[PDB]
Amino acid sequence: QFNPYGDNGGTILGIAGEDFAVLAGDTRNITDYSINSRYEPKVFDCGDNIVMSANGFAADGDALVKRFKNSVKWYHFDHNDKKLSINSAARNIQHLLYGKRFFPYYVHTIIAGLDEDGKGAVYSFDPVGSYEREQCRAGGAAASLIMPFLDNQVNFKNQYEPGTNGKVKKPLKYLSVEEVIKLVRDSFTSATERHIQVGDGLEILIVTKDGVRKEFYELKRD
Amino acid sequence: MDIILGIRVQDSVILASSKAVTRGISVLKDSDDKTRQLSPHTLMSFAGEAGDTVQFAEYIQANIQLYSIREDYELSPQAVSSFVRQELAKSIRSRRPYQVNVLIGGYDKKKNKPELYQIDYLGTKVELPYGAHGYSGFYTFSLLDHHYRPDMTTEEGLDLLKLCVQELEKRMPMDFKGVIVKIVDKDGIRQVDDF
Amino acid sequence: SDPSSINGGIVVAMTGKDCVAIACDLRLGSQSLGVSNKFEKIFHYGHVFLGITGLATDVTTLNEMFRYKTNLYKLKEERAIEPETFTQLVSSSLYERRFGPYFVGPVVAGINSKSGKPFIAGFDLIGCIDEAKDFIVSGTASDQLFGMCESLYEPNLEPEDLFETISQALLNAADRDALSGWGAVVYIIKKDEVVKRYLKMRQD
Amino acid sequence: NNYDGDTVTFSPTGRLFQVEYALEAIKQGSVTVGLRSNTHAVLVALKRNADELSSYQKKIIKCDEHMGLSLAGLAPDARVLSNYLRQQCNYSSLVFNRKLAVERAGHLLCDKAQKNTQSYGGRPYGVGLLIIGYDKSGAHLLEFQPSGNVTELYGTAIGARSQGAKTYLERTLDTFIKIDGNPDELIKAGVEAISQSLRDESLTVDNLSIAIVGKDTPFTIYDGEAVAKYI
Amino acid sequence: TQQPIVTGTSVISMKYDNGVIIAADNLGSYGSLLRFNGVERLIPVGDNTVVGISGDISDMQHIERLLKDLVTENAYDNPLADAEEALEPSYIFEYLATVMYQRRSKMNPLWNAIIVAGVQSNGDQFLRYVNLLGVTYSSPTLATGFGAHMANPLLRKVVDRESDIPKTTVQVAEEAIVNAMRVLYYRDARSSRNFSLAIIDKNTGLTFKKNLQVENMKWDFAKDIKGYGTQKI
Amino acid sequence: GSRRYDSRTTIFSPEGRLYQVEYALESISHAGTAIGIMASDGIVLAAERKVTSTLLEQDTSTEKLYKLNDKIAVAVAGLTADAEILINTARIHAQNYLKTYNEDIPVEILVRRLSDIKQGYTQHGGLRPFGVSFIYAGYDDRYGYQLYTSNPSGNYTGWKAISVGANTSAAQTLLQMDYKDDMKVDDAIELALKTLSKTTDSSALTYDRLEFATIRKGANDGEVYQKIFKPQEIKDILVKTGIT
Amino acid sequence: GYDRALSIFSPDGHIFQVEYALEAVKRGTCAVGVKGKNCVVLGCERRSTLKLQDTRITPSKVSKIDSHVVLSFSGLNADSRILIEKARVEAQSHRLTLEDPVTVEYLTRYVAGVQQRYTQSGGVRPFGVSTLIAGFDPRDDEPKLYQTEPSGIYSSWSAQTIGRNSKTVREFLEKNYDRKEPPATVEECVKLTVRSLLEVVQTGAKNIEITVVKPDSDIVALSSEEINQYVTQIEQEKQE
Amino acid sequence: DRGVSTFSPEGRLFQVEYSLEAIKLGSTAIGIATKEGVVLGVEKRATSPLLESDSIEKIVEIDRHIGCAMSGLTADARSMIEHARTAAVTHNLYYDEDINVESLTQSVCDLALRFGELMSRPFGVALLIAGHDADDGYQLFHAEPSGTFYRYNAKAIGSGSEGAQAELLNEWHSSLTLKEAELLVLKILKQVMEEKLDENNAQLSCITKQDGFKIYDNEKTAELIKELKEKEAAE
Amino acid sequence: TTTLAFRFQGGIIVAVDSRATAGNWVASQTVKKVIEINPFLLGTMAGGAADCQFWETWLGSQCRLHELREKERISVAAASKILSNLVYQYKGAGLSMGTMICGYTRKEGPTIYYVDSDGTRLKGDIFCVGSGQTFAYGVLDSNYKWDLSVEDALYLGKRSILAAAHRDAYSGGSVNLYHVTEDGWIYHGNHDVGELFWKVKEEEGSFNNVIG
Amino acid sequence: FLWX
Amino acid sequence: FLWX
Ligand SMILES: [Mg+2]
Ligand SMILES: [Mg+2]
Ligand SMILES: [Mg+2]
């Protein structure tokens, strides 16, 4: 029987700073045990300082990103070139995803940018449009490897102040863009080592008030 | 849903309906009224699939209430039962049938006679002296075959009903948290508060 | 979950000398559980009699449907429908629902008012007509009824004799079926009088 | 007279009066000017107000990053036709990853307007449009009329006293066509053109509406203090 | 929901300094039966694009008609149909990509893997893949079926990343493709010796080569293979 | 377009009247007179056939009096063809009710639904109304014996005695003169014929120009019988009252 | 389907079909609504050119929409039946979804909405009917009286009349009804309603219908003798 | 007769031009936009003294940040309001934000021309749509049955409109306080109203960023009417 | 998941956990399972995250349109029935929702309605919904009285989620507390089970099964 | 598919 | 059903 879904592998990672946000994703595209591309970007600038990735089944991923980009275009037309806020984008994507509740988009969606107060924001979605704002989210094949590391290093979980008898927690604080990119690079090198569907390249899109900057780093190609 | 009984006696119809609403391994409620008044002298108890039961009961209630206003006249219990049966008879060959079984207890003011109608989800209607739905019947029918008499009073009918509930509480596997009892007669519908 | 054997029940029709007989049990059950011992399966529209076995909701629905149709027939034709014509109406109606059928085994019986000829007919569930001189059988004890009728029946029985033959045919067949019995009704039909008798039978 | 009841009826001389009456709605509309060089295309629109308390009716609509029009006549009809162009431009992008040619845009508007002139019940569109755009064959200016006739021009004007600007552009043709790689000078020529269609009133800051598209310029509209430069 | 009947096997392709090469054998298989031997699976669109199709041949012939019709439609009311407003590889791909994904989303797919090889108007090399699921990806080397398993490894030894494309000549690139076709003939049980090859160069244009044959095959070593273990004679 | 040829059948006059309803009533006023008289123990339906020809088959004919079910009959005034459309609809509505509730339809419910259909043709659809007036004679166990009339407007009212068609003005004056509440069926039969005899446009009232029907409880014990009179039975009842 | 726009604007800005529908209302028998301190009363004229009527079975002028709301009307009788039927269905539909009977305002707003729809729907003429809708909101003792008309406008009235010679009885109510002190009792409210109809009717025999609505679904129609007592009392006080 | 969607020789839609005549017959409605808020006021115009004037609802809430006043065949406005309310709530569901006053007005105006041979005739009612959004601040819009809408600093519609508009021309300046605007609406209403202005035959409302859209009580309006009369006598 | 709502003298208490799972994988511990429809209406979520979140947000839109149209805050009964009638239209399609509509109105008083995706709608004084409902019932039922103080009721609601958070593998993260009065709902904070467990264990002297 |  |  014809199976309409497939798995194109790869993994994505969104972290939110004080006055910035990053959305990173590996550039490997696979089917079964074959590499399709060593460089196929799946983290996109959608305009209005929103970056988006829909990891999983690449066909559904591209369809969704395409539809949201188009949604941004018509928002401008219908509402006098008003800037689409990240919170408004998030709700719009819920409606896109849930629209196919009974034939879902087989993707995990993450968007990043700045909220209306100018502070870093990350929103993550299930395949049928349940969404939540977070400081931190990994998505895709190696999400189970990266996420518990982020819990430990970003949100400082299970870490107690030395000599306080495990009574005082390590205090939460915003990370610098330099410190966040270190964690992204170490998350992806670690993921590449232990997951076969992750590697080839890492592409990071950094969002500040000044706009969207890109950074690229090599990953192991085995 | 599970236990719904009905006993037609000389001058009234008595409907007993279990109070338990169970989902999974949790009794969510122990005071549920599995009945709707269709008209002043017609009462319908219902049991079956979750959601369908109340949705069907309230839909019938609305239609009978609409007829009552339009004609300024109460439909006979026979007429209401025939209407309800046809709705279920339509339902069974629908895309998603109502999985609801009902008893209709009514007092015909023109005939001055109590009437009990047993209708399953297929649209199988029967007039009975006593009726039951689900596993309840497997105990109550043989018991009523023995103890029932057609000329009994309402008080005798309630004692005969207590005998059924006692037998069900003894031999039924599931805890149905007792029953709400309602009497339909010439004076309309009233609820027995202590059972 | 076999629609034709949930409720259970039987109908049998026979022809005699200038007369027909149609008989049915009174049981309505839900598989093992007996529910009603008053469920009659024989109806009539003027002088034309229809017995219906099978799923009881469809027995009720078809009775209501043929009453509806025979009533409009009488208003437009200004006369009562005849057995031969009604037989065709039943067949048309059943085959209309060819790919979603009524789970029923209908049996027409009556005397043509013009010719005075005794007439009986049976149908399958999709509406195929089974015309017979001797007898028609239907229901959960059809095998038993076939065996009883084929041995007991003889042609040109008088109404009083035909009554004994059809009654013994139904009773002995019903006692060898779990889902049939719980009382019986026999219609003896002459040109211009009809006698309806309730039989005494074992109540198990 | 007897042949102006609906669009489905020809006159004895072979005229469609309902189409001609729709054409009349444009003449009543406020003046708007279109002109282009080889690098840029410019729309200049005189906006109209109900009174001194009212806003000035917005004449210019964006269709894509590389295309947009100005309107003269029934604004709701312009909204319907502009919305249709946005969809056709958008269909070309999503399906063919291809910017819609300004010429095809015209052909699509022509065919949409035509269907309303041949069917009972419907009515002709009561608006004229000037479509500017920059595509794979350089700068373009189109004039749409609700008869269905679309015409590619170097420059033109539609609305009340449009003949003044149209005569000026006909004289200036040789000058403004060679304003290449200079947005501000092409706009000035457009603002000087629309000035020939003014009577008693002059160009103010909330009165003038300018739009431009070109080689390294997305379709962008200028209103309010942004057009103060050109008065 | 389909099942493919008459099928075509591997389509292989790679970029070089000035353009792209694409190749595909001339076989129409009917399961294990090698039924049709005259089947062209490379279909040129204009003078700047070639579409290589594997999978169901009835669906391939349908896609042929769509592309033929696309050229006709593009010429309508288009004075620049043979110039600035000619069909680009990127336009032709996006159209097919849209169709493939619409068909999978209606649970009635075109049972194909498609590679669109061409050169854009600005001289850029275009090479992109789409299949029955509507999955799209681009890479210096692309292949379908067995080609993905056996051709890609050999082609990637020549052009491993982007920076290797300017260093790769049409001589080297074509040699790699013709070698890959031979390897596929050795090891693919639904391949044929006869194949077609197309070069789309930004200078010399579209060069379409028909009735090529796999040659310089090593079989001699077979004479020295006796039994499966212990047999000596 | 087609607007040019539209009569606009469903519009108001400046005075607030429905043109097509008024003109349909003018049509009915030229139709043969139909009388209904309701007694305490039955209802009479009488109707005058439109100028009969001597070669018309009288016994196997039905122009005026139709049967809706076993308990309800109608007398027609207007276009026979129009009436037969509405009668077939009424007959079905009666069987739909019986199928649903296993009870014969109450007279007023049937009359309301038929009157609601007529109302529709005056408010929407752009079609001409039905050029028909009915006299409904029926019995139900709620109100007993009931006479109604409906007209093209879709308005219906209840009556003790009523006329429709030609010379209703003259007919209604004679009924209003000789009717009383404690009247018997046999008396109502006589009144019905005496009324038609005086209001007829013919020279003399004869059996061949009349349709006649009674709805009595004259059957055996608490059940209603419909009697559509045969030619010979009308001839007998016409001699018995002394009109011929 | 029949599509024609029957209700359209004229040069002077009038919709003649809506204004001609009002002329049908003006032709209709008089209907009056008077709301007291703790009750509403609906009075209705019945023209006396119809003798040999059967008042048992003849449709009554006042209709129950629910057990707590009533609707009287003036204009085309056949049109009124369609509005009453829709209202009765909406009354049950509201109970089914909101688990609460309609407010008089909500039921009025619905009926008014239906009347409006027919004034800008193709193929249909407006309803030749104005309605008086009266009753009490659930668990409320404040009397409610509303009026609708073919155009679809509706509003609340202390007292209002519609139909033929309605301008005469409105003249009467305008000087005889005190806003500061409405009829305190049922008797006072019924009397003022009968008085207002006796300005127009003719005789106070079988020409006047009176329906009294009270809080908590307490609706009763007065008989001939009950109404005749008010007529006899008013005429004796008049001779002064 | 003639088509519903027909053009006159001058190039106007007959049915649209005739609906404008209907709106002139309607009761007066006045809107004034300031930097402190937008004020909406209407003439109620009760046809009889028995009619309970508080049941006359000619000022209406669309959302917390958008109000609406109407003039003409007010029955026609019910479906327009219903659409506006659905549009406003629907936009909030899809985008988790308030909808721009202009975008709401444009949505209502899209209904206007959806008539012909869709509904049978244009609307016989004009709307004053007043609101506030973060982008363009306090706004007043006039929505006609032509499908056109203008933004206004102040606008009068209805029977006394041409007289009231000429008055609004002189009185309006860009530094009006909310309290000044309230009195100005009351002043101009009293001038053009047939019957004498009081709290029972005239209604005031306003929309402010802080408190949203609020219809004033008869008690509140009565104090402003008394404040207005004193100030006019005071010079 | 684990959500409970109960009625008492001082109004309604609503307690939820914050854990979201995808099988045995803990997706999040920072999920809001209570939706604030309006100042007097609360909605609880269990089962499908997308289904609950989408349709309870949509319910909030329908409740807003009701008060615009009827110039009056929607009843808890009407609000609950809009949701129950919606899910009933989708019955058999495979929506997964366990829902409690909690709020106060003048005509009703404090009211709780259980609404689930097979179309069941029940009024009641106590409900626990989710994978850990039985664990919450155990503690809640055994300690519940009508005469509980606002302080004690808030604690019992909190302690009943903690009980489930501990034993149920698919419940935990943090406890979100709400109190519904005649004046509307009041938020009583987010309580991380990380700290709350040890605090309760120490102060209460309970959880003796655990290595202290 | 997230659960709750 | 029946067969022949
Ligand atoms: Mg790896
Ligand atoms: Mg049964
Ligand atoms: Mg047995």
Domains and CATH numbers, chain I: 1-212 (3.60.20.10)
G74/G162 Cα distance (integer angstroms): 6
- Look up residue D45 and give its two tokens: 């629109």
E47 contacts E206 by C-beta, under 8 angstroms: yes
Query: Do J3 and I49 lie within an 8 Å CB cutoff?
Result: yes
D169 contacts D35 by C-beta, under 8 angstroms: yes
Query: Do C38 and B92 lie within an 8 Å CB cutoff?
Result: no
DSSP G59: P
Residues of E with CB under 8 A from a CB of A: 1-2, 101, 104-105, 107, 109, 129, 132-139, 148-149, 152, 161-162
Which chain I residues touch J1 with a CB distance below 8 Å? 22, 48-50
H123 contacts G116 by C-beta, under 8 angstroms: no
- Look up residue G214 and give its two tokens: 């009270």
Domain span at residue C200 reads 1-204
What angle separates helix G77-98 from helix B52-71, to the nearest 10 degrees? 150
Pairing relation of β-strands B130-133 and A21-26? Answer: unpaired
D150/C59 Cα distance (integer angstroms): 72
F69 contacts F114 by C-beta, under 8 angstroms: no
E144/E113 Cα distance (integer angstroms): 6
What CATH number is given to the structural domain containing D137?
Answer: 3.60.20.10
Chains that touch D (3 or more CB pairs under 8 A): A, E, F, H
Contacts of B46 (CB under 8 A, 6+ apart): B1, B4, B34, B35, B36, B53, B54, B56, B57, B100, B101, B102
**Beta-bridge partners for H36:** none
Q: Which of G3, G9, G116 to mutate to test the interface with H (most CBs of H within 10 A)?
A: G9
G8/D9 Cα distance (integer angstroms): 23
F137/F72 Cα distance (integer angstroms): 6
Answer whether D79 touches E (CB < 8 Å). no
Which chain F residues touch D120 with a CB distance below 8 Å? 1-2
Breaks (C-N over 2.5 A) in chain B follow: none
Q: Is H40 helix (H, G, I), strand (E, B) or coil?
A: strand
All structural domains of chain A = 1-222 (3.60.20.10)
What CATH number is given to the structural domain containing C189?
Answer: 3.60.20.10
User: CA of F206, closest CA in chain C: separation in Å?
Assistant: 25
Catalytic residue among E1, E7, E72, E98: E1
Query: Do I75 and G106 lie within an 8 Å CB cutoff?
Result: no
User: CA of F3, closest CA in chain H: separation in Å?
Assistant: 8
Q: What resolution does the deposited structure have, in angstroms? A: 3.0
G7/H22 Cα distance (integer angstroms): 14
Phi, psi of B151 (to 5 degrees): -100, 15
H80/H141 Cα distance (integer angstroms): 15
D24/G228 Cα distance (integer angstroms): 70
DSSP string, E147-162: HHHHHHHHHHTT-SSG
DSSP F221: S
DSSP string, D29-63: SPPEEEEE-SSEEEEEEE--BSSTTBPBPP-EEEE
Chains that touch C (3 or more CB pairs under 8 A): B, F, K
Which chain F residues touch G25 with a CB distance below 8 Å? 16
**Beta-bridge partners for D213:** D41
G58 contacts G78 by C-beta, under 8 angstroms: no
**Quick one: CA dihedral I86, I87, I93, I99, positive or negative?**
positive
Structural domain boundaries in chain F = 1-244
CATH homologous superfamily of domain F1-244?
Answer: Aminohydrolase, N-terminal nucleophile (Ntn) domain (3.60.20.10)
H112 conformational bin, left if phi > 0, alpha if psi -120 to 50, beta if neither: alpha
Answer whether B26 touches I (CB < 8 Å). yes
Residue G89 CB: number of other CB atoms within 10 A? 16
Residue C175 CB: number of other CB atoms within 10 A? 14
CATH class held by domain B1-195 = alpha beta
- Let me know if I1 is a catalytic residue: yes
Instruction: Report how far apart, in Å, the C-alpha atoms of I209 and of each of F110, I153, I206, I212 are.
Output: 77, 25, 9, 9
Q: Which residue has the tokens 């060959």?
A: B93
**Quick one: CA dihedral F165, F169, F170, F171, positive or negative?**
positive
Instruction: Report how far apart, in Å, the C-alpha atoms of F74 and of each of B14, F97, F227 are.
Output: 45, 18, 13
Half-sphere exposure at residue D169, Cβ-oriented, CA atoms within 13 angstroms: 29
CA end-to-end distance (rounded Å), chain B: 19
How many domains does chain C contain in total? Answer: 1
E135/A36 Cα distance (integer angstroms): 10
How much of chain D is in helix, strand and coil states, percent to nearest 5?
35, 25, 35
Phi, psi of B43 (to 5 degrees): -125, 135
CB pairs < 8 Å spanning C and K = 7
Answer whether G142 touches H (CB < 8 Å). no
A81/H220 Cα distance (integer angstroms): 40
Contacts of H88 (CB under 8 A, 6+ apart): H62, H63, H66, H99, H104
Torsion of CA C57, C60, C65, C66, to 10 degrees: 140
- Look up residue E36 and give its two tokens: 């049709």
Any binding-site annotation on I22?
no
E28/A145 Cα distance (integer angstroms): 46
CA end-to-end distance (rounded Å), chain F: 61
F75/F134 Cα distance (integer angstroms): 6
CA end-to-end distance (rounded Å), chain K: 10
G125 contacts G136 by C-beta, under 8 angstroms: no
Q: Is A116 helix (H, G, I), strand (E, B) or coil?
A: coil
Answer whether B36 touches C (CB < 8 Å). no
C59 contacts C43 by C-beta, under 8 angstroms: no
Query: Do C64 and F102 lie within an 8 Å CB cutoff?
Result: yes
> How far away, in angstroms, is A147 Cα from ligand 1 center?
18
Domain span at residue D229 reads 1-231
Nearest to G18 by CA among G151, G155, G164, G147: G151
H35/H47 Cα distance (integer angstroms): 36
Q: Which residue has the tokens 């919904």?
A: I129
**Quick one: CA dihedral C108, C110, C111, C112, positive or negative?**
negative
F7/F18 Cα distance (integer angstroms): 12
Which chain G residues touch F12 with a CB distance below 8 Å? 17, 20-21, 23-24, 125, 128
DSSP H27: P
Query: Do H89 and I68 lie within an 8 Å CB cutoff?
Result: yes
- Look up residue E192 and give its two tokens: 């044929």
Query: Do D55 and H155 lie within an 8 Å CB cutoff?
Result: no
E112/E96 Cα distance (integer angstroms): 11
A131/A147 Cα distance (integer angstroms): 17
What angle separates helix D75-96 from helix A58-78, to the nearest 10 degrees? 160
E108 contacts E2 by C-beta, under 8 angstroms: yes
Opening angle at CA E98, ends E97 and E104, nearest 5: 90
Q: Which residue has the tokens 């559980």?
A: C33
D32/I30 Cα distance (integer angstroms): 57
**Beta-bridge partners for E213:** E194
Nearest to E50 by CA among E97, E90, E85, E89: E89
Catalytic residue among I1, I3, I99, I105: I1
Which chain A residues touch E136 with a CB distance below 8 Å? 58-59, 62
F108/F131 Cα distance (integer angstroms): 21
How many domains does chain D contain in total? Answer: 1
G24/G19 Cα distance (integer angstroms): 9
Phi, psi of F234 (to 5 degrees): -70, -40
- Look up residue E107 and give its two tokens: 């649970």
**Beta-bridge partners for F46:** F35, F212
Residue I21 CB: number of other CB atoms within 10 A? 19
A143 contacts A56 by C-beta, under 8 angstroms: no
Q: Is C11 helix (H, G, I), strand (E, B) or coil?
A: strand
Helix (H) or strand (E) segment spanning residue A88? helix A86-98
G40/H169 Cα distance (integer angstroms): 49
Residues, chain D: 231
Q: How was this structure determined?
A: X-ray
DSSP string, G75-96: E-HHHHHHHHHHHHHHHHHHHH
- Look up residue B34 and give its two tokens: 């599995």
Task: Note whether F touches E: 3 CB pairs or more under 8 A.
Answer: no
- Look up residue F174 and give its two tokens: 């004679």
Closest ligand, as measured to the CA of A197: 1
Closest ligand, as measured to the CA of A221: 1
User: Which strands, in side-by-side order, build the sheet including G69-75?
Assistant: G63-64, G69-75, G129-135, G144-148, G154-156
Where do the H-state alpha helices sit in chain C?
A: 56-77, 83-96, 142-152, 159-174
Amino acid at F133: S
Amino acid at A35: I
What's chain J's Rg over C-alpha atoms? 4
CA end-to-end distance (rounded Å), chain D: 46
- Look up residue I93 and give its two tokens: 């399609």
Contacts of D137 (CB under 8 A, 6+ apart): D101, E80, E84, E85
| Chain C, window 20-49: residues with a beta carbon less than 8 angstroms from a chain F beta carbon | none
Contacts of D135 (CB under 8 A, 6+ apart): D66, D67, D99, D100, D101, D102
G105 contacts G60 by C-beta, under 8 angstroms: no
All structural domains of chain E = 1-233 (3.60.20.10)
Pairing relation of β-strands E33-36 and F34-39? Answer: unpaired
Task: Note whether C touches K: 3 CB pairs or more under 8 A.
Answer: yes
Task: Note whether K touches J: 3 CB pairs or more under 8 A.
Answer: no
How many helices (H) and strands (E) chain C has is answered by 4, 12
Answer whether H86 touches I (CB < 8 Å). yes
Query: Do I134 and B51 lie within an 8 Å CB cutoff?
Result: no
- Look up residue A31 and give its two tokens: 């089917």
What distance lies between CA E61 and its chain's CA centroid? Answer: 15
G91 contacts G103 by C-beta, under 8 angstroms: no
Buried b (16+ CB within 10 A) or exposed e, I47-71: bbbbbbbbbbbebbbbbbbbebeee
Phi, psi of I196 (to 5 degrees): -60, -40
All structural domains of chain H = 1-235 (3.60.20.10)
Pairing relation of β-strands A107-114 and I174-181? Answer: unpaired
Three-class HEC string of chain E:
CCCCCEEECCEEEEECCCEEEEEEECCEEECCEEEECCCCCEEECCCCEEEEEEEEHHHHHHHHHHHHHHHHHHHCCCCCCCCCCCCCHHHHHHHHHHHHHHHHHCCCCCCEEEEEEEECCCCCEEEEEEECCCCEEECCEEECCCHHHHHHHHHHCCCCCHHHCCCCCHHHHHHHHHHHHHHHHHHCCCCCCEEEEEEEECCCEEEEEEEEECCCCCCHHHHHCCCCCCCCC
Among partner residues B93, B128, B138, which is closest to C36 by beta-carbon distance?
B128
Instruction: Report how far apart, in Å, the C-alpha atoms of D86 and of each of D66, D78, D82 are.
Output: 11, 12, 6
Nearest to C12 by CA among C118, C158, C166, C130: C166
**Beta-bridge partners for H138:** H132
- Look up residue F97 and give its two tokens: 């009710």
A193 contacts A220 by C-beta, under 8 angstroms: yes
B25/B20 Cα distance (integer angstroms): 12
G117/H75 Cα distance (integer angstroms): 9
Nearest to D197 by CA among D61, D34, D77, D36: D34
